[PDB]
Amino acid sequence: FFKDYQKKNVMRLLQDSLEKIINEWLKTDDESHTKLKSLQELSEMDINATSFAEHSPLPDFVTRLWLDPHKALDAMDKNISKNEIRKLIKETAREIELVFTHQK
Amino acid sequence: FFKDYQKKNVMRLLQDSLEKIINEWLKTDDESHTKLKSLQELSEMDINATSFAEHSPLPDFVTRLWLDPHKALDAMDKNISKNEIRKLIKETAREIELVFTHQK
């Protein structure tokens, strides 16, 4: 149940990033709808296909995620240090303690 | 800005998982507060320390994330396939198309 929970949350994270990047990209589409058309093409692409992604107007995050999802999910945490995570764990432990013991 | 956005979202994802797992674990603490005490210890641990995590009552996800954050962030997407991600990309592309073109 927890692992399913974690999986669904990772999928949400990816969907959120896709939405943010694609929506920002779309607001400067040209008069001939080059960007919208590429997005419509993407929605119809064969999931076994990769050639389209090498020379594409699509956002780089979109084609990187398509081409190699596991690699893309590693560029996403590249700026996070071991120190930052352990600090987050300590901070979270303290927060939970204060709530669980009804101090906050 | 986007990469900072992605980083903050990954940190949120981790915090959410920590909260869910630790809160579930705490509700079956013993009378002597073994679990709460281990959590209080965790909040005070030196971020250079690792020995405590090998033999600990803490949830396994918590000690795995502490010991090797990058490795832990890989066990999190181990159940996600290339097919699933490309399907998500196509589905998201279609959703965005319908909103952007005011069909939905």
DSSP string, B64-98: HHHH-HHHHHHHSSTT--HHHHHHHHHHHHHHHHH
Any domain includes A98:
no
Q: What does the block give as tokens for A93? A: 């432990």
* B37 domain residue, yes or no: yes
φ/ψ of residue B28, rounded to 5: -120, 45
Chain B CA closest to residue A36 = B97
| Residue A35: HSE in the Cβ half-sphere, 13 Å Cα cutoff | 18
A79 in a structural domain: no
Q: Which domain holds residue A58?
A: 2-67
Question: Does residue B29 fall inside a structural domain?
Answer: yes
In a domain, B61, yes or no: yes
B67 in contact with chain A, both atoms CB, cutoff 8 A: no
Q: Say if A42 falls within a structural domain.
A: yes
Q: Report helix angle B2-26 to A2-26, nearest 10.
A: 160
Is A60 domain-assigned? Answer: yes
Q: Decide: residue A64, CB within 10 A, 0-12 exposed, 13-18 middle, 19+ buried.
A: middle
Q: How far apart are CA A46 and CA B62, in angstroms?
A: 39
- With respect to residue B62, please indicate whether it lies within any of the assigned structural domains: yes
How far is the C-alpha of A15 from the C-alpha of A11, rounded, in Å? 6
Taking an 8 Å cut-off on Cβ atoms, the answer to whether A66 and B77 are in contact is no
Q: Residue B85: which residues within 8 A CB-CB, separation 6 or more? A: A14, A65, A66, A69
CB atoms closer than 10 angstroms to residue B5: 13
Amino acid at site B73: L
Q: How far is CA A55 from the centre of its chain?
A: 21
Quote the CA–CA distance of A18 and A27 in Å, as a whole number: 15
Per the structure, the count of domains in chain B is 1
Measured between beta carbons, the chain A residues lying within 8 angstroms of B79 are: 3, 7
The coordinates were experimentally obtained by X-ray
Alpha carbon B102 to chain centroid, angstroms:
36
